[PDB]
Amino acid sequence: TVNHGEEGKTREQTSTPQINEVSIKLYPVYAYPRTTQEIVDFSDVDIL
Amino acid sequence: ADGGYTVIPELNTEIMRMLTDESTMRRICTVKKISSNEFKQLVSAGGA
């Protein structure tokens, strides 16, 4: 806040600015595809 | 105690695999190394 006051009028304590803290947590977006060894070995696509 | 601990039994480092045998199936039959889940051999019935 910014106060106005006057000539010869005492000055009140203005409220100090506030600070906010955003906690951006990290979280693992994992992929766990259980492919069989059958597909990898049999196919010529190299499915990995 | 009388020099009996000194004598160690010489373990033959080649274990005798009792159930070993040359695979008669793989010898009498043909072996086709392949890269696929299914193997299609074409066997002409005849009729010509």
Question: Cβ separation of A38 and B36 shorter than 8 Å?
Answer: no
B4: left (phi over 0), alpha (psi -120 to 50) or beta: alpha
With CA atoms as reference, report the closest residue to A33 among A47, A22, A19.
Answer: A47
Q: Are A24 and A16 in contact (CB under 8 A)?
A: no
- For residue B27, the 8-state DSSP code is H
Angstrom CA distances, B6 to B2, B3, B10, B29, B33, stand at: 9, 6, 12, 53, 53
Question: Cβ separation of A38 and B35 shorter than 8 Å?
Answer: no
Solving technique for this entry?
cryo-EM
Q: Which two tokens stand for residue A32?
A: 């766990």
* Centroid of chain to Cα B43: 29
Rounded Cα distance between A38 and A3, Å, is: 76
With CA atoms as reference, report the closest residue to A45 among B39, B36, B33, B41.
Answer: B36
CA distance B15 to chain A (A): 32
Contact of B37 with chain A, judged by CB distance below 8 Å, is answered with yes
Question: Cβ separation of B37 and A44 shorter than 8 Å?
Answer: no
* Length of chain B as a residue count: 48
Q: Are A48 and A40 in contact (CB under 8 A)?
A: yes
